[PDB]
């Protein structure tokens, strides 16, 4: 019944919260993004909404770094993404100041999820309509996490989200290996992004970022073009 679909702080007679489901539906209607954890690195790929010649390449990016070893990509709303990125950077700096060592990935994910949970329990606000993918590298061991609008986080090995993500998930299930490398993971990420793409992919309409023991790096358009030409 529609009597419980309007207010955030109301339980359905079946014990359900509906506005959070609607926020998840908002998340599932954005641009696709893919994350794959290889044996010695993590790769993040996504589409971009500009897809035009009037856009300036130096203005706004979707894959952003938090620390020397942490980066993330989103799927959903962008204005809600910027504030969370700023808060994550501030939390990482606070941790470094107190403990004099870089923050582990798990702690950062926990604190960000705790921040996001607060907006789903009080009347007068709305939940965040965004979902996050966080990659890191600590003690010589890669990590990959995903955080929901509810404030719940999972640890993944390969995932997809955004438009047409069930087919992406089953594609990844069909062609994922536990003993992969970074180049193979990049090729698989490009292929699973191409699966849901509609136009002609170039180096100007996707973003790729990787994370290995050296640090978190965002690939330049020339490198993306070279990788795209490799698989044809």
């Amino acid at each position: 019944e529609r009597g419980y679909s309007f207010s955030l702080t109301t339980f359905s007679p079946s014990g359900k919260l509906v506005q959070i489901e609607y926020a998840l539906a908002a998340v599932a209607g954005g641009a696709p993004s893919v994350g794959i954890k290889a044996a010695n690195g993590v790769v993040l790929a996504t589409e971009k909404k500009q897809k035009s010649i009037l856009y300036d390449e130096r203005s706004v990016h979707k894959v952003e770094p938090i620390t020397k070893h942490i980066g993330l990509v989103y799927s959903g709303m962008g204005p809600d993404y910027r504030v969370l990125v700023h808060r994550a950077r501030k939390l990482a700096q606070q941790y470094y100041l107190v403990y004099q060592e870089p923050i582990p990935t798990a702690q950062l994910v926990q604190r960000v999820a705790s921040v996001m949970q607060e907006y789903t329990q009080s009347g007068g606000v709305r939940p965040f309509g965004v979902s996050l993918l966080i990659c890191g590298w600590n003690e010589g061991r890669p990590y990959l996490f995903q955080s929901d609008p509810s404030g719940a986080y999972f640890a993944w090995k390969a995932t997809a989200m955004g438009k047409n993500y069930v087919n992406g998930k089953t594609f990844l299930e069909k062609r994922y290996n536990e003993d992969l490398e970074l180049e193979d993971a990049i090729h698989t990420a490009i292929l699973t992004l191409k699966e849901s793409f509609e136009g002609q992919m170039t180096e100007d309409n996707i973003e790729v970022g990787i994370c290995n023991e050296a640090g978190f790096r965002r690939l330049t358009p020339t490198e993306v073009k070279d990788y795209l030409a490799a698989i044809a």
């Binding site: 609607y22 998840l24 539906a25 203005s59 706004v60």
Partner: protein
């Protein structure tokens, strides 16, 4: 607060079953209420803003009717939409720029100003007491290492940097015309930028312009201060275009 209206359409903090906010889209629709159009073009060493000027009455004072503002000594602006909301946002932008200068010891960059305005504007979307402002802001300026810069922000809180943008009723046609021009060629001088900016509006609205029906503001590398052109210079440009 006197409560929140019930419906998938009548409040800012209520998600639709398909997961979309409709008050933000209605705020977007509120931009076209004025009936004017704006075009911004970035050149090799200059940036130009062109907009319409409608004076319906004859008892009005045409000197007090304008849409080009000035944020700092080296940043211009142009607003589209509701007049009072535009003026209020202009005042807020001036305050933010002054505060940044005081706190950091040097002039605020265009992208930083746009990001600050967008971050402030996003908060109105997540609270039940406040409502979005029905206007969009376009800024121009010159960076130190980089050349000219053109930026735009919208009521939803999303901002981006462009090469040639437009806003208003004829946004789609202006965008198509500018896309064709940019794809053809982009190396432009000061004279070419103003000419193409005027030509876009002229060919989209199908109007032969007059010197008192438009207003132009430019920023150049030689003189990095915002300057508003006069009727004589606008007429000279129009005559050169016609010839």
């Amino acid at each position: 607060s006197r409560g929140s209206s019930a419906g998938f359409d009548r409040h800012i903090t209520i998600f639709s079953p398909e997961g979309r906010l409709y008050q933000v889209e209605y705020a977007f629709k509120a931009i076209n209420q004025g009936g004017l159009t704006s075009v911004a073009v970035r050149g090799k060493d200059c940036a130009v803003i062109v907009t319409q000027k409608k004076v319906p009455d004859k008892l009005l004072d045409s000197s007090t009717v304008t849409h080009l503002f000035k944020i700092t000594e080296n940043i211009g602006c142009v607003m589209t939409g509701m007049t009072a909301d535009s003026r209020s946002q202009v005042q807020r932008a001036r305050y933010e720029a002054a505060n940044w200068k005081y706190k950091y010891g040097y002039e605020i960059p265009v992208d930083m100003l746009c990001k600050r305005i967008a971050d402030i504007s996003q908060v109105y979307t997540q609270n039940a007491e406040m409502r979005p402002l029905g206007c969009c802001m376009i800024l121009i300026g010159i960076d130190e290492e980089q050349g000219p810069q053109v930026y735009k922000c919208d009521p939803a809180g999303y901002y981006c940097g462009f090469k040639a943008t437009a806003a208003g009723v004829k946004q789609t046609e202006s965008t198509s015309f500018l896309e064709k021009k940019v794809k053809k060629k982009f190396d432009w001088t000061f004279e070419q930028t103003v000419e193409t900016a005027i030509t876009c509006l002229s060919t989209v609205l199908s109007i032969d312009f007059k010197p008192s029906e438009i207003e132009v503001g430019v920023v150049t590398v030689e003189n990095p201060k915002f300057r508003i052109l006069t009727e004589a210079e606008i007429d000279a440009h129009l005559v050169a275009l016609a010839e």
